[PDB]
Structures are given as structure tokens and as C-alpha cells.
Amino acid sequence: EMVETVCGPVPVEQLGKTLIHEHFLFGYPGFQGDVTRGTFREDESLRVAVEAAEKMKRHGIQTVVDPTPNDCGRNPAFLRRVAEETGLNIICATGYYYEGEGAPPYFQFRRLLGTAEDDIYDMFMAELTEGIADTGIKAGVIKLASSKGRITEYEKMFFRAAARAQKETGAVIITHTQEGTMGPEQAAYLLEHGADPKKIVIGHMCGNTDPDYHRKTLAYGVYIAFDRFGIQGMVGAPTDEERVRTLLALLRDGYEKQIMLSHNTVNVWLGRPFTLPEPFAEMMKNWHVEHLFVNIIPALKNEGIRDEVLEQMFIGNPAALFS
Amino acid sequence: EMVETVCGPVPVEQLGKTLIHEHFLFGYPGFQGDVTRGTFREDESLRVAVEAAEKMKRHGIQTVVDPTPNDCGRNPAFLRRVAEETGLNIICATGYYYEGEGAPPYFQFRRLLGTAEDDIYDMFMAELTEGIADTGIKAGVIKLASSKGRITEYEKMFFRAAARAQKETGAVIITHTQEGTMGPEQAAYLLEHGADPKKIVIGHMCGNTDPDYHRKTLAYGVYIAFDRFGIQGMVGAPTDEERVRTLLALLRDGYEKQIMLSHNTVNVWLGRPFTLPEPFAEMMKNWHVEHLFVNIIPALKNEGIRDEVLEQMFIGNPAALFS
Numbered sequence: 001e002m003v004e005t006v007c008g009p010v011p012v013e014q015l016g017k018t019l020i021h022e023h024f025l026f027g028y029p030g031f032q033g034d035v036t037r038g039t040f041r042e043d044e045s046l047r048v049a050v051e052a053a054e055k056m057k058r059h060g061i062q063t064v065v066d067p068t069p070n071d072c073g074r075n076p077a078f079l080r081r082v083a084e085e086t087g088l089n090i091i092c093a094t095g096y097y098y099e100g101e102g103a104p105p106y107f108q109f110r111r112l113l114g115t116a117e118d119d120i121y122d123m124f125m126a127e128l129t130e131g132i133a134d135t136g137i138k139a140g141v142i143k144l145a146s147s148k149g150r151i152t153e154y155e156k157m158f159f160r161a162a163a164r165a166q167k168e169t170g171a172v173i174i175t176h177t178q179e180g181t182m183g184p185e186q187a188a189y190l191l192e193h194g195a196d197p198k199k200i201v202i203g204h205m206c207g208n209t210d211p212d213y214h215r216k217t218l219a220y221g222v223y224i225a226f227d228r229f230g231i232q233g234m235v236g237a238p239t240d241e242e243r244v245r246t247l248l249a250l251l252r253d254g255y256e257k258q259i260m261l262s263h264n265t266v267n268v269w270l271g272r273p274f275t276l277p278e279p280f281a282e283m284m285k286n287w288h289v290e291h292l293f294v295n296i297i298p299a300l301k302n303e304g305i306r307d308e309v310l311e312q313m314f315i316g317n318p319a320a321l322f323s
Numbered sequence: 324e325m326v327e328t329v330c331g332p333v334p335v336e337q338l339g340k341t342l343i344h345e346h347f348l349f350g351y352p353g354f355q356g357d358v359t360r361g362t363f364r365e366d367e368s369l370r371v372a373v374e375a376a377e378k379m380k381r382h383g384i385q386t387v388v389d390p391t392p393n394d395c396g397r398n399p400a401f402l403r404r405v406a407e408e409t410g411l412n413i414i415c416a417t418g419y420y421y422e423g424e425g426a427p428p429y430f431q432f433r434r435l436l437g438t439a440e441d442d443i444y445d446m447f448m449a450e451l452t453e454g455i456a457d458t459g460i461k462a463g464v465i466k467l468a469s470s471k472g473r474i475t476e477y478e479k480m481f482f483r484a485a486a487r488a489q490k491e492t493g494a495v496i497i498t499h500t501q502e503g504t505m506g507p508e509q510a511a512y513l514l515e516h517g518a519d520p521k522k523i524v525i526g527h528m529c530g531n532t533d534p535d536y537h538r539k540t541l542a543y544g545v546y547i548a549f550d551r552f553g554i555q556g557m558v559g560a561p562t563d564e565e566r567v568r569t570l571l572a573l574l575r576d577g578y579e580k581q582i583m584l585s586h587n588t589v590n591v592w593l594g595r596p597f598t599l600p601e602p603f604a605e606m607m608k609n610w611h612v613e614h615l616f617v618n619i620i621p622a623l624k625n626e627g628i629r630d631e632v633l634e635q636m637f638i639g640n641p642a643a644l645f646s
């Protein structure tokens with residue numbers, strides 16, 4: 001029926017063509033400490049974010065899910081500015097990043113007080129059903145994240161609280177997997193705690209190039225996201241050629257109704273500007289919001305993937321997920 | 324001669340009685356993500372901070388050093404509001420917390436880009452000599468922090484940059500030591516890189532109850548701070564009785580000109596309010612800004628410590644340190 005967006009409730013039937021994982025803003029925890037050299041340029045960032053939105057619109061995209069974690073610079077009022085400007089539906093998340101690159105000290109301390117897991121659940125419920133801060137914006141998804149080869153004790157608090165919140169709210173869960181690990185483990189743990197597989201997207205699955213790993217995850221009935229197209233040679237990521245090979249295998253094996261695609265772009269980096277060193281720069285040059293539509297999709301079509309299959313992924317699947 | 328305070332340059336001769344380590348505000352990294360349930364109450368926090376300042380003033384304190392790390396909610400304009408209100412001199416810091424409870428992902432990423440250590444030096448220089456953000460406030464100290472039993476590779480970037488900045492600026496360095504470890508190692512590493520021991524305070528030394536450890540550190544010519552009076556049974560801290568025993572040994576051994584005292588209070592916690600569980604609550608009940616003056620000092624006097632020795636610690640030493 002309905003999903004909460006940064007502009008309020010929208011009928012799921014009107015989401016249309018959707019990108020399941022992109023970031024308008026993103027900062028690595030600690031960016032706040034580099035304020036003198038890395039101040040947030042409100043108006044300039046908005047122009048940049050708005051242009052990204054317009055680029056997506058030119059390729060038919062009507063909706064973007066931006067699951068920026070709470071501890072990584074999430075800014076719903078900023079997202080609303082983008083939406084009010086461009087007409088794009090933007091759905092935001094409630095949740096924390098994984099332990100390795102997130103900001104665990106705060107909830108690790110509350111865990112010592114013995115209230116962390118309850119406090120996280122309370123946060124999820126407030127942001128799903130009441131509003132984020134004083135913005136009046138509700139999250140439409142819960143974001144979860146795990147570490148390489150482990151769901152840590154810290155991370156597990158969020159997993160359990162997320163399952164609890166989903167049972168109460170029906171909210172969609174979208175996950176981060178680190179370096180192609182823990183996909184099946186995330187699904188099985190969430191389902192153990194009562195989560196609904198039809199409301200779960202296991203993310204960054206494109207980080208693993210073994211189709212058997214994908215099938216192991218898909219067996220749980222969840223969605224999987226190939227959501228890092230364009231990211232090559234960093235964060236342990238495979239090449240797009242490898243992503244495409246893996247994707248083609250799964251589509252030809254009939255898994256179209258469980259797969260979604262995205263880039264995981266960061267359109268505005270929080271903190272101090274930087275330039276990637278030439279090694280990484282070249283490999284990452286295709287990491288932008290138009291990449292799927294100008295490079296990947298054409299390659300898929302040339303490989304015989306039909307328009308109806310593409311439509312299932314970009315339109316059909318997000319509609320089912322949120323409805 | 325002069326030191327930068329949150330209200331501009333002040334003659335070091337007018338610092339008077341000083342507390343070397345207290346926090347008006349402090350949050351564990353990740354507090355930002357708990358904004359819905361943990362919003363910062365600007366006006367209420369100011370009242371609380373101002374009352375803390377007034378309590379200190381009633382015991383003769385004229386100056387407080389607040390070394391809240393950049394990644395732990397440092398807010399110089401807020402400190403200025405307190406100072407403009409109460410007349411208290413407040414000196415603030417530039418620096419990041421230790422790896423375990425700080426926010427390393429940001430500079431760990433820049434380390435991958437190969438610019439982190441240079442960027443940290445640039446930050447220190449900007450905040451020491453130009454101003455923090457657009458506040459116009461300059462830091463008067465560089466804050467450094469190390470982990471339990473290790474100065475990590477992450478932490479070392481800050482240590483090296485701090486030594487580099489001190490050589491250029493003459494800024495005072497104040498450190499955090501974790502669970503009574505690395506005191507001698509911090510001094511030796513800073514001195515290796517050209518830092519001036521007469522401009523260094525090794526902090527949280529009260530966390531170690533072996534006077535030989537203290538002497539090992541003192542041998543470098545640095546200051547040491549017994550700066551966590553009131554903290555008992557948490558963060559691996561000893562009891563105040565143990566702190567006093569250790570302190571008495573060092574004073575009776577003639578180290579008065581190298582020792583400073585403080586509480587490390589957190590007067591306003593950032594994020595969601597909390598209550599310590601009864602075990603910790605009782606042990607921590609003396610953790611407040613008046614504790615040194617109403618409990619510890621009287622105990623020292625009863626142990627025969629003379630007024631001139633107390634004056635050396637609270638007045639003489641900070642004057643020498645900053646001049």
C-alpha cells in the first residue's frame with residue numbers, strides 16, 4: 001500500500017523505476033572532527049545532489065532508496081530539499097553502520113549500561129513510526145550492516161532489534177555485507193528472529209563472484225542486491241565484468257524476481273575533499289549514477305536479457321518489496 | 324607569555340588556579356546517530372555547564388583546560404558561551420581520541436589515500452594558528468590519545484603530527500593514557516620526534532598505582548596528571564584511596580613541580596540521557612567538579628601536604644607549562 005518517503009506517505013504503486021541503494025550524502029565517522037578543513041557547504045551540496053537526481057530522472061528513475069547510516073552523516077531534511085526540488089521520491093533509513101567503519105563507541109557504552117539493544121529498538125520504532133529528530137520524516141527502511149566474515153556481537157544487537165521492529169511495523173530491511181561475506185548468515189539470523197524474507201534485501205551481494213553463494217542466500221526467499229556497479233579495486237570489490245558474469249548466471253537460472261541493481265554512489269562526500277590516487281581513480285571512473293543505464297544495461301541487452309526482465313528488477317521487485 | 328583561550332589571547336600570568344582536564348560537553352562517537360532520542364538541548368546544557376563553572380569558581384578556580392577531542396563532540400563556540408557568562412578562562416584542544424573509543428574510519432580512509440598524516444598536521448596548524456571552523460577560536464593545546472598497552476599505527480599519525488606542530492607553534496600537548504599504560508612510551512616517542520618535555524602533560528597517570536611507572540615517566544621531564552579523581556570502578560580505574568597513596572609517594576619524593584590534578588568530569592553528556600546501574604553509581608558518586616576541593620585536598624592536608632605544594636600544583640605548574 002504505502003511507504004514513507006522524505007516527503008511523506010506515497011502509494012507503493014507510484015514508486016516506478018527505482019534505484020535501491022545510492023547515497024546523496026555520506027561521511028566516514030570522524031568527518032565531524034575535520035570541520036575546519038571540511039565544512040559542509042549547504043547550498044553547493046544541494047546543487048550537486050540535485051544534479052545527480054536529475055541525471056537519474058533522465059534515465060527514467062522515479063524513486064531512490066538512500067540508506068545512509070545514522071552514524072555516517074544521514075541528513076533527512078537535506079534529502080527532502082532534494083525531493084522538493086526534483087520531484088524524485090527518496091526513501092531513507094534508520095540504522096547504524098558495521099563495527100569496522102561505523103561509530104560503535106556510543107552503543108558499546110550503552111551495552112555496558114545494559115540498555116543498548118532496547119535503546120536501538122526504541123530508536124528504530126521512533127524513526128519508523130513517529131519521525132526522525134524534528135524533521136517529521138519517517139524512515140521507510142531499516143539499514144543493517146555486518147563485518148567481514150562475522151556478524152559481531154555489536155552488530156547482532158541491531159539485527160535483533162531490526163527483526164523486532166519489522167514484526168511490529170512491516171518495515172523493509174536492507175543490509176550491507178562486507179567483502180562478499182555473511183549473506184546466507186544474515187538471512188538465516190534475521191529469519192531465526194522472526195523477520196519476513198519478503199521484506200529483506202541482502203546487499204552488496206555483487207561482492208561475491210561465486211553464484212553458489214548467491215543461490216545459498218536466495219534459498220531463504222530474500223532479495224539480493226547487486227548494488228555496487230562502478231566500484232572496482234577498492235573495498236575488496238570485484239570488477240564490473242565479474243558482476244555481470246555472476247548476474248547473467250543468476251538471471252539465466254531464473255532468479256530475476258529476487259534481484260535488484262544499484263551503484264552505491266556517494267554524490268557528496270562529507271568532510272575534506274579528496275582525490276583518488278591514479279591506480280584507484282581509473283578503476284573507479286565509472287562509479288556514477290548513470291553507469292547502470294549507459295554501460296551495464298546495454299551490455300546485458302547485448303547478452304540477450306529481455307526488457308521485461310529489466311523491468312522486473314527496476315520496477316516489479318521494488319513494488320513487491322515495499323507492498 | 325600568552326595562551327589562546329576560547330575568548331582570545333590571555334597572559335599566562337593571569338591563568339591563576341587551574342584545572343587541567345575537565346569536559347563541559349562530551350559524547351562517545353556515534354552519539355550523533357541517536358539524535359531522535361538524544362537531541363542537544365542548547366539552553367539547558369548551557370545552564371548546566373555554567374553551574375559547573377560557578378562551582379569551580381567558588382573554590383578559586385580561574386581557568387579550566389577542556390581537551391574534548393574533535394571526534395567526541397568538541398564545541399568551542401559553546402565553551403565561549405560559558406566563558407562569556409562566567410568569566411572563567413577556558414582553553415580548548417585540537418586532536419582526536421584513541422582508536423578504541425574514537426572515530427578512526429575517517430582518517431583511516433585518508434591514510435589509504437596517503438594524505439592522512441599531512442592532513443592531521445594541517446588541521447592542527449589551522450586550529451592552533453588560524454581558528455576552529457568559523458568560530459575564530461584557536462586551540463591552546465593538542466590532545467593526543469593512545470590505546471591499552473599500545474600506541475597504534477593510527478594513533479602514531481597524530482603523535483608525529485603533534486610533535487611537528489609543537490615544533491612550529493610551541494603549543495602544549497596533553498595526552499590520554501588508557502588503563503594506566505604507555506606513559507613512558509608516549510613521552511619517549513614524542514621526544515624522539517622533537518617534542519619539548521616541558522610542554523607535555525602525560526594524562527590519566529593516576530590509572531597506574533605503581534610509583535615506579537610514574538617515576539619512569541617523570542624521568543623524561545614531562546608533566547604528569549592525576550586527572551581522574553572521582554572515577555572509580557569504571558574504565559579500569561583504581562580507587563581514590565589508591566590515587567592518593569600514589570600521589571603522596573611522589574610528593575614525598577619531591578615531584579611536586581611535575582604533577583597536576585583534575586577530575587575529567589563530563590558535565591553534559593551528548594546523546595541520550597542515562598543512569599549508571601547501582602554498582603557503578605555508588606562508586607562514581609564523587610565524580611564532580613568540587614571533589615578535589617572538598618574531599619581530596621583536605622585528605623592531603625591531613626597527610627601533611629603543605630599549602631605551597633598545593634599552590635605549585637594548581638597555580639605554579641600550569642603557569643610554567645603554558646609559559
Ligand SMILES: CCCC(=O)N[C@H]1CCOC1=O
Pocket residue numbers: 026231234235264266
Ligand atoms: C571511494 C572508494 C569507494 C568507497 O569507498 N565506497 C564506499 C563509500 C560509501 O559506501 C562505500 O561502499
Ligand SMILES: CCCC(=O)N[C@H]1CCOC1=O
Pocket residue numbers: 349554557558587589
Ligand atoms: C561514566 C563512567 C566514567 C567514564 O565513562 N568516563 C569517561 C567519560 C569521558 O572521559 C572518560 O574517562
Ligand SMILES: [Fe+3]
Pocket residue numbers: 176177204
Ligand atoms: Fe554498504
Ligand SMILES: [Fe+3]
Pocket residue numbers: 499500527
Ligand atoms: Fe581521556
Ligand SMILES: [Zn+2]
Pocket residue numbers: 021023264
Ligand atoms: Zn551504501
Ligand SMILES: [Zn+2]
Pocket residue numbers: 344346587
Ligand atoms: Zn578526558
